[PDB]
Write a protein that binds this ligand. Structure first.
Ligand SMILES: [Zn+2]
Length: 325
């Protein structure tokens, strides 16, 4: 499969030897629903730590490209947009990480979910790290399952910065997040605020309130992970222009019309599986301005956002709306 290109006209208007190097974390979320975010009007405070952080924009109208990890994750990094995106040929397309890497941005992908679903396949494999096992993830024995935790993807990031001193960096952290059906496994005891909690894999058999409690508890652990990611970025804010993008890959059905989990084809998927949260945070010194919080946005906004974050322009997406101006 030879590579089909889309942005080899891309140019970086300023280089990190002539201005401040830029360091961005893009959290690729998992199964998070927009309508269970407190900032979007949910009845529960599911993001208490993200709330205390100044400079975070919550986007209340974001629609995902699809309803599954294999479908949406390549669409998120693609140049084609949702209405031309072909999941079966995405692996052979130049994607936005191929462009930024070719332009010299240091690309790191850490995965506590599954893998990059083909996004990183053209880059050297040393740039992808499996964080689902203790060989990389130092934070696994904090729960009765010894499930490795998303926050463990932040450990050792300082040594990655040290190895790329004075370069632009884009760090993708692929979250386990709210992956089901075992939502009760996805968070440590610290986040068991909502009880009782469904523990069965047979979601339709659980009490509904119990199912929601486990789901919302998992969101509390993602709140903690995003906050810690911003806090890590703040420790490098003097030498680097730092920012954090979070977007979920899709939402989740939680019993509506007897539908559970996700992956329903777009042609008849419910609203709940495509309505996703998005958050953007930047340091005041970066000069990045977020779009209005109620901008109508989709996964198509991600690729132009990453390019803008590193001062890159490509004809392919020059008219496209991003999360930032
Ligand atoms: Zn997913």
């Amino acid at each position: 499969g030879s590579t089909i290109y889309h942005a080899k006209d891309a140019v970086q208007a300023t280089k990190p030897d002539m201005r401040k190097p830029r360091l961005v974390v893009f959290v690729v979320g998992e199964t998070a629903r927009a309508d269970h975010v407190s900032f979007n009007g949910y009845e529960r405070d599911t993001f208490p730590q993200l709330a205390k952080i100044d400079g975070v924009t919550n986007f209340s109208n974001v629609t995902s490209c699809g309803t599954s990890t294999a479908y949406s994750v390549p669409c998120m990094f693609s140049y084609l947009g949702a209405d031309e995106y072909d999941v079966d040929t995405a692996k052979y397309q130049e994607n936005v990480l191929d462009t930024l890497d070719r332009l010299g941005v240091s690309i790191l992908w850490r995965d506590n979910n599954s893998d990059s679903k083909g996004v990183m396949d053209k880059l050297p494999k040393a740039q992808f790290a499996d964080y689902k096992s203790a060989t990389n993830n130092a934070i696994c024995n904090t729960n009765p399952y010894n499930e490795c935790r998303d926050v463990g993807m932040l450990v050792g990031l300082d040594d990655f910065v040290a190895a790329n001193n004075g370069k632009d960096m884009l760090i993708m952290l692929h979250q386990m997040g709210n992956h089901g059906p075992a939502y009760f496994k996805r968070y440590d005891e610290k986040f068991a605020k909502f009880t009782p909690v469904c523990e069965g894999n047979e979601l339709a058999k659980c009490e509904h309130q119990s199912l929601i409690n486990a789901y919302d508890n998992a969101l509390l652990a993602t709140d903690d992970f995003i906050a810690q990611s911003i806090q890590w970025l703040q420790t490098h804010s003097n030498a680097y222009d730092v920012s954090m993008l979070y977007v979920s890959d899709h939402g989740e059905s939680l019993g509506e019309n007897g539908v559970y989990l996700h992956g329903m084809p777009n042609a008849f998927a419910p609203k709940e599986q495509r309505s996703v949260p998005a958050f953007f945070w930047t340091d005041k010194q970066t000069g990045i301005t977020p779009m209005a919080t109620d901008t109508v946005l989709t996964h198509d906004a991600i690729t132009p956002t990453l390019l803008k974050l590193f001062d890159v322009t490509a004809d392919k997406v020059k008219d496209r709306t991003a999360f930032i101006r």
